[PDB]
């Protein structure tokens, strides 16, 4: 029986418990740098410690993508088929690194079925892509069929978010183009573009109205929602995640949905109180 495959995801992409329990998913860790602390975004770094370090540090956190060599090493294993899921190429060097890792692999070990998916997204966008790879594999697709089906899924997939604090994204150059100080409680509803950049979709005064407007934006774009899994990541605001889930359910029916805590990289850029939605 051929499940000779592995799904490698950079650490921005959260894993559910079931994905951790599965074994076919593996993270490649990014780096996080805050003042003189240099950490690896992995399961040893607790969100609370990270949020407290962010809150204490006057200077903005910095991050680094994984190296090509780390990606190469993750490809070298007994699995015949390697699928890699990364942060948007427009937000991070993770995609390019994964690709170069494949070039190095082939120089050292020869040809292998390795495909790098640029998510054009972040966080649970990556998670959902990883789930789709597994779904395709479970359906018995060939390697190239999985690549085609997943690239199609990426094209259908849209990302939305509302944060309390956009400064880490702004200061690290991830919000370029998007112009900026009206009402102090104004909350932008942000989202992906089809190229994997960030844009502003809407805005509202206060979080309660912004979550409704976010729900409406998601609902305006979604098609064939019954075929889709909806994902919500939250940074230290589980009840806000549940309320978003409730608002979305009022607007359209999905196959299923789930909620996760933000990863290290997701926490760094979303900040305390952030909500990310993907379908
Ligand atoms: Na390294
Ligand atoms: Na206003
Ligand atoms: Na408003």
CSV table of C-alpha atoms and ligand atoms in Angstrom, one decimal:
chain,number,residue,atom,x,y,z
A,1,UNK,CA,0.0,0.0,0.0
A,2,UNK,CA,1.5,3.3,-1.3
A,3,UNK,CA,1.3,6.2,1.0
A,4,UNK,CA,5.0,6.9,0.2
A,5,UNK,CA,4.7,10.7,0.6
A,6,UNK,CA,5.6,13.4,3.0
A,7,UNK,CA,4.1,17.0,3.4
A,8,UNK,CA,6.6,19.5,4.6
A,9,UNK,CA,5.2,22.8,5.8
A,10,UNK,CA,7.1,25.9,7.0
A,11,UNK,CA,6.4,26.6,10.7
A,12,UNK,CA,4.0,29.5,9.9
A,13,UNK,CA,1.5,26.9,8.9
A,14,UNK,CA,-0.3,25.6,12.0
A,15,UNK,CA,-0.9,21.8,12.5
A,16,UNK,CA,-4.1,20.5,14.2
A,17,UNK,CA,-3.8,17.7,16.8
A,18,UNK,CA,-4.9,15.2,14.2
A,19,UNK,CA,-2.2,16.4,11.8
A,20,UNK,CA,0.4,16.1,14.6
A,21,UNK,CA,-0.9,12.6,15.3
A,22,UNK,CA,-0.8,11.6,11.7
A,23,UNK,CA,2.9,11.5,10.9
A,24,UNK,CA,2.9,12.4,7.2
A,25,UNK,CA,3.3,16.2,8.1
A,26,UNK,CA,6.6,17.8,9.1
A,27,UNK,CA,7.5,21.3,9.9
A,28,UNK,CA,10.6,23.2,8.8
A,29,UNK,CA,11.2,26.0,11.3
A,30,UNK,CA,11.6,29.7,10.7
A,31,UNK,CA,13.7,31.9,13.0
A,32,UNK,CA,12.4,34.7,15.3
A,33,UNK,CA,14.6,37.5,16.6
A,34,UNK,CA,13.5,39.9,19.3
A,35,UNK,CA,16.3,42.1,20.9
A,36,UNK,CA,19.0,39.5,21.8
A,37,UNK,CA,16.8,36.5,21.9
A,38,UNK,CA,17.0,34.3,18.8
A,39,UNK,CA,14.4,31.5,18.8
A,40,UNK,CA,13.4,28.8,16.5
A,41,UNK,CA,9.6,28.7,15.7
A,42,UNK,CA,8.9,25.3,16.9
A,43,UNK,CA,6.9,23.3,19.5
A,44,UNK,CA,9.3,24.2,22.3
A,45,UNK,CA,8.4,27.9,22.0
A,46,UNK,CA,5.3,28.6,24.1
A,47,UNK,CA,3.0,31.3,22.8
A,48,UNK,CA,2.7,33.0,26.2
A,49,UNK,CA,6.5,33.4,26.4
A,50,UNK,CA,6.6,34.8,22.9
A,51,UNK,CA,3.8,37.3,23.5
A,52,UNK,CA,5.4,38.5,26.7
A,53,UNK,CA,8.7,39.0,25.0
A,54,UNK,CA,7.0,41.0,22.2
A,55,UNK,CA,5.1,43.1,24.8
A,56,UNK,CA,8.4,43.8,26.7
A,57,UNK,CA,10.5,44.6,23.7
A,58,UNK,CA,10.4,48.1,22.5
A,59,UNK,CA,11.9,47.1,19.1
A,60,UNK,CA,9.8,45.3,16.6
A,61,UNK,CA,10.4,41.5,16.2
A,62,UNK,CA,12.3,40.2,13.1
A,63,UNK,CA,12.0,36.8,11.4
A,64,UNK,CA,14.0,34.6,9.0
A,65,UNK,CA,12.9,32.0,6.5
A,66,UNK,CA,14.4,28.4,6.7
A,67,UNK,CA,17.6,27.8,4.8
A,68,UNK,CA,17.8,25.9,1.6
A,69,UNK,CA,19.9,23.3,3.4
A,70,UNK,CA,17.3,22.6,5.9
A,71,UNK,CA,14.7,22.1,3.2
A,72,UNK,CA,17.1,19.8,1.3
A,73,UNK,CA,17.6,17.7,4.4
A,74,UNK,CA,13.8,17.4,4.9
A,75,UNK,CA,13.4,16.1,1.3
A,76,UNK,CA,16.0,13.3,1.8
A,77,UNK,CA,14.0,10.4,3.3
A,78,UNK,CA,12.2,7.2,2.4
A,79,UNK,CA,9.0,8.9,1.0
A,80,UNK,CA,8.7,8.7,-2.7
A,81,UNK,CA,6.7,11.9,-3.1
A,82,UNK,CA,7.6,15.2,-1.4
A,83,UNK,CA,5.1,18.1,-1.2
A,84,UNK,CA,6.3,21.4,0.3
A,85,UNK,CA,3.9,24.2,1.5
A,86,UNK,CA,5.2,27.6,2.2
A,87,UNK,CA,4.3,31.1,3.0
A,88,UNK,CA,3.4,33.4,0.2
A,89,UNK,CA,6.5,34.1,-2.0
A,90,UNK,CA,5.6,37.8,-1.8
A,91,UNK,CA,5.8,37.9,2.0
A,92,UNK,CA,8.8,35.7,2.7
A,93,UNK,CA,11.9,34.0,1.2
A,94,UNK,CA,10.6,30.6,2.4
A,95,UNK,CA,9.2,29.7,-1.1
A,96,UNK,CA,12.5,30.6,-2.8
A,97,UNK,CA,14.5,28.7,-0.2
A,98,UNK,CA,12.4,25.6,-0.6
A,99,UNK,CA,12.9,25.7,-4.4
A,100,UNK,CA,16.7,26.2,-4.0
A,101,UNK,CA,16.7,23.3,-1.6
A,102,UNK,CA,15.2,21.1,-4.3
A,103,UNK,CA,18.0,22.2,-6.7
A,104,UNK,CA,20.6,21.3,-4.1
A,105,UNK,CA,18.8,18.0,-3.5
A,106,UNK,CA,19.0,17.1,-7.1
A,107,UNK,CA,22.7,18.0,-7.3
A,108,UNK,CA,23.5,15.8,-4.3
A,109,UNK,CA,21.0,12.8,-4.7
A,110,UNK,CA,19.5,12.9,-8.2
A,111,UNK,CA,15.9,13.3,-9.4
A,112,UNK,CA,13.0,13.0,-6.9
A,113,UNK,CA,9.3,13.9,-7.1
A,114,UNK,CA,9.5,17.1,-5.1
A,115,UNK,CA,7.0,20.0,-5.6
A,116,UNK,CA,7.0,23.3,-3.7
A,117,UNK,CA,3.5,25.0,-3.4
A,118,UNK,CA,3.6,28.8,-3.0
A,119,UNK,CA,0.5,29.1,-0.8
A,120,UNK,CA,0.0,32.8,-1.7
A,121,UNK,CA,-1.1,32.9,1.9
A,122,UNK,CA,0.1,32.3,5.5
A,123,UNK,CA,-0.9,30.5,8.7
A,124,UNK,CA,-4.0,28.3,8.2
A,125,UNK,CA,-3.9,29.0,4.4
A,126,UNK,CA,-0.8,26.6,4.5
A,127,UNK,CA,-2.6,24.2,6.9
A,128,UNK,CA,-5.5,23.9,4.5
A,129,UNK,CA,-3.2,23.3,1.5
A,130,UNK,CA,-1.4,20.5,3.5
A,131,UNK,CA,-4.9,18.9,4.2
A,132,UNK,CA,-5.7,19.1,0.6
A,133,UNK,CA,-2.5,17.3,-0.4
A,134,UNK,CA,-3.4,14.5,2.0
A,135,UNK,CA,-7.0,14.4,0.7
A,136,UNK,CA,-5.7,14.0,-2.9
A,137,UNK,CA,-3.2,11.3,-1.8
A,138,UNK,CA,-6.1,9.5,0.0
A,139,UNK,CA,-8.1,9.6,-3.2
A,140,UNK,CA,-5.3,7.7,-5.0
A,141,UNK,CA,-4.1,10.5,-7.3
A,142,UNK,CA,-0.7,10.3,-9.1
A,143,UNK,CA,2.0,12.8,-8.0
A,144,UNK,CA,1.2,15.2,-10.9
A,145,UNK,CA,-2.6,14.9,-10.3
A,146,UNK,CA,-2.0,15.9,-6.6
A,147,UNK,CA,0.1,18.9,-7.9
A,148,UNK,CA,-2.6,20.0,-10.3
A,149,UNK,CA,-5.5,19.6,-7.8
A,150,UNK,CA,-3.7,21.4,-5.1
A,151,UNK,CA,-2.6,24.3,-7.3
A,152,UNK,CA,-6.3,24.6,-8.3
A,153,UNK,CA,-7.2,24.7,-4.6
A,154,UNK,CA,-4.6,27.4,-4.0
A,155,UNK,CA,-6.2,29.5,-6.8
A,156,UNK,CA,-9.7,29.0,-5.2
A,157,UNK,CA,-8.4,29.8,-1.6
A,158,UNK,CA,-8.8,33.4,-0.2
A,159,UNK,CA,-7.4,34.7,3.1
A,160,UNK,CA,-8.7,37.4,5.4
A,161,UNK,CA,-7.6,38.9,8.7
A,162,UNK,CA,-8.3,41.5,11.3
A,163,UNK,CA,-5.6,42.4,13.9
A,164,UNK,CA,-5.4,44.6,16.9
A,165,UNK,CA,-1.9,45.5,16.0
A,166,UNK,CA,-0.6,45.8,12.3
A,167,UNK,CA,2.7,47.4,13.3
A,168,UNK,CA,4.9,44.2,12.9
A,169,UNK,CA,3.6,43.7,9.4
A,170,UNK,CA,4.0,47.4,8.6
A,171,UNK,CA,7.4,47.8,10.0
A,172,UNK,CA,8.8,44.6,8.4
A,173,UNK,CA,7.7,45.8,5.0
A,174,UNK,CA,4.8,43.4,4.4
A,175,UNK,CA,2.1,46.1,3.9
A,176,UNK,CA,3.7,48.1,1.1
A,177,UNK,CA,1.5,50.1,-1.1
A,178,UNK,CA,-1.4,50.0,1.4
A,179,UNK,CA,-1.9,53.5,2.7
A,180,UNK,CA,-2.3,54.4,6.4
A,181,UNK,CA,-4.9,58.0,11.2
A,182,UNK,CA,-8.7,58.6,11.6
A,183,UNK,CA,-10.7,57.1,14.5
A,184,UNK,CA,-8.5,55.4,17.1
A,185,UNK,CA,-10.7,52.3,17.1
A,186,UNK,CA,-10.7,51.8,13.3
A,187,UNK,CA,-9.9,48.2,12.4
A,188,UNK,CA,-8.9,47.4,8.8
A,189,UNK,CA,-10.3,44.1,7.4
A,190,UNK,CA,-7.3,42.8,5.5
A,191,UNK,CA,-6.9,40.1,3.0
A,192,UNK,CA,-4.8,38.3,0.3
A,193,UNK,CA,-4.6,39.2,-3.3
A,194,UNK,CA,-4.5,36.5,-5.9
A,195,UNK,CA,-0.7,37.2,-6.2
A,196,UNK,CA,-0.2,36.6,-2.4
A,197,UNK,CA,0.2,40.2,-1.3
A,198,UNK,CA,-1.8,41.9,1.4
A,199,UNK,CA,-4.6,44.4,0.7
A,200,UNK,CA,-7.3,46.3,2.6
A,201,UNK,CA,-10.8,44.9,1.9
A,202,UNK,CA,-12.8,47.1,4.4
A,203,UNK,CA,-12.7,48.8,7.7
A,204,UNK,CA,-14.9,49.4,10.7
A,205,UNK,CA,-14.9,51.2,14.1
A,206,UNK,CA,-14.2,48.6,16.7
A,207,UNK,CA,-13.6,44.9,16.6
A,208,UNK,CA,-17.2,43.8,16.9
A,209,UNK,CA,-18.2,45.6,13.7
A,210,UNK,CA,-15.0,44.6,11.9
A,211,UNK,CA,-15.6,40.9,12.5
A,212,UNK,CA,-19.1,41.3,10.9
A,213,UNK,CA,-17.6,43.1,7.9
A,214,UNK,CA,-14.9,40.4,7.7
A,215,UNK,CA,-17.6,37.7,7.7
A,216,UNK,CA,-19.4,39.5,4.9
A,217,UNK,CA,-16.2,39.8,2.8
A,218,UNK,CA,-15.5,36.1,3.2
A,219,UNK,CA,-19.1,35.3,2.3
A,220,UNK,CA,-19.0,37.6,-0.8
A,221,UNK,CA,-16.1,35.8,-2.3
A,222,UNK,CA,-16.7,32.2,-1.3
A,223,UNK,CA,-18.0,29.7,-4.0
A,224,UNK,CA,-18.9,26.1,-3.7
A,225,UNK,CA,-18.5,26.4,0.2
A,226,UNK,CA,-20.0,23.0,0.7
A,227,UNK,CA,-16.8,21.5,-0.9
A,228,UNK,CA,-14.6,23.4,1.5
A,229,UNK,CA,-13.1,23.3,4.9
A,230,UNK,CA,-13.0,26.7,6.7
A,231,UNK,CA,-10.1,27.5,9.0
A,232,UNK,CA,-9.7,30.0,11.7
A,233,UNK,CA,-6.5,30.9,13.5
A,234,UNK,CA,-6.5,33.2,16.5
A,235,UNK,CA,-3.8,34.7,18.7
A,236,UNK,CA,-4.8,34.4,22.4
A,237,UNK,CA,-8.5,35.1,21.6
A,238,UNK,CA,-10.4,31.9,21.4
A,239,UNK,CA,-13.8,33.4,22.1
A,240,UNK,CA,-13.3,35.9,19.3
A,241,UNK,CA,-12.5,32.9,17.1
A,242,UNK,CA,-15.7,31.2,18.1
A,243,UNK,CA,-17.8,34.3,17.3
A,244,UNK,CA,-16.2,34.5,13.9
A,245,UNK,CA,-17.1,30.9,13.3
A,246,UNK,CA,-20.7,31.7,14.3
A,247,UNK,CA,-21.0,34.7,12.0
A,248,UNK,CA,-19.6,32.7,9.1
A,249,UNK,CA,-22.0,29.9,9.7
A,250,UNK,CA,-24.9,32.3,9.5
A,251,UNK,CA,-23.7,33.3,6.0
A,252,UNK,CA,-22.8,30.0,4.3
A,253,UNK,CA,-22.5,26.3,4.8
A,254,UNK,CA,-19.0,24.6,4.7
A,255,UNK,CA,-18.0,21.0,4.8
A,256,UNK,CA,-16.4,21.6,8.1
A,257,UNK,CA,-14.4,24.1,10.0
A,258,UNK,CA,-11.8,24.3,12.7
A,259,UNK,CA,-10.0,26.7,14.9
A,260,UNK,CA,-6.3,26.7,15.9
A,261,UNK,CA,-3.9,28.7,18.0
A,262,UNK,CA,-1.4,30.8,15.9
A,263,UNK,CA,2.1,29.4,15.3
A,264,UNK,CA,5.2,31.3,16.3
A,265,UNK,CA,5.5,33.2,13.0
A,266,UNK,CA,1.7,33.8,12.9
A,267,UNK,CA,1.8,35.1,16.5
A,268,UNK,CA,4.7,37.5,15.6
A,269,UNK,CA,2.8,39.1,12.7
A,270,UNK,CA,-0.8,38.7,13.9
A,271,UNK,CA,-0.1,39.9,17.4
A,272,UNK,CA,-2.2,39.5,20.5
A,273,UNK,CA,-5.9,39.5,19.6
A,274,UNK,CA,-5.5,38.7,15.9
A,275,UNK,CA,-7.9,36.6,13.8
A,276,UNK,CA,-7.1,35.0,10.4
A,277,UNK,CA,-9.8,33.3,8.3
A,278,UNK,CA,-9.3,31.1,5.2
A,279,UNK,CA,-11.6,29.1,3.0
B,1,LIG,NA1,20.3,26.5,9.6
B,2,LIG,NA1,-14.5,55.9,10.0
B,3,LIG,NA1,-18.3,51.2,10.7
